[PDB]
Amino acid sequence: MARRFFLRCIIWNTRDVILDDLSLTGEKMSDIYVKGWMIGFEEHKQKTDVHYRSLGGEGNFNWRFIFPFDYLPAEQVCTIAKKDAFWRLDKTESKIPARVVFQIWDNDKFSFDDFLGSLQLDLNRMPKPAKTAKKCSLDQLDDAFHPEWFVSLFEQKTVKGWWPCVAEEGEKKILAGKLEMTLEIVAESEHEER
Ligand SMILES: [Ca+2]
Ligand SMILES: [Ca+2]
Ligand SMILES: [Ca+2]
Ligand SMILES: [Cl-]
């Protein structure tokens, strides 16, 4: 059966975010905000408020996202279709991995917002978070050589800490920002804590 879950995301802060603009005084800065959504549920995407005029790449948000999604425990696969009748968005089935996306953006008033970097996470196999922003690095993404550093959120239920965001210089990967988050998968009915 398809079971209804909820991904609860708190965006606490960002650090080291790329600075995309020049100030009227001529100082590098970004008007930072964070976009999030689950793949296959692009209709429910959400964003934080904007941390205006970040001069050192830091932003403060303390923002809560809730992402509802359907899940097949036995298949460990997302059903991009919501629930019940065809009236639901994404019709029926389509089985894909459960993944959430976080994107860091610079808000502009007099042009379009500019993409700064993103992080895409597999809820079944995701990199462990760094305790501090200092220990946050692209090494966290090393699924090839340190597979023990990937884990499953469904098993752990909750993870907190820092993850890196990435921008592609063509094939090359560059640290575009660091994201401090709490991630928790929540059931419709279960014990408050285990
Ligand atoms: Ca800009
Ligand atoms: Ca801007
Ligand atoms: Ca722009
Ligand atoms: Cl602007």
Side-chain angles (χ1 to χ4, degrees), residues 5 13 16 23 51 69 72 156 170 189 192:
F5 285 103
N13 301 281
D16 290 5
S23 78
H51 178 114
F69 67 103
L72 285 303
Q156 276 213 33
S189 134
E192 160 55 26

Side-chain angles (χ1 to χ4, degrees), residues 20 106 108 111-114:
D20 171 76
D106 166 60
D108 287 333
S111 71
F112 275 30
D113 304 347
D114 312 302

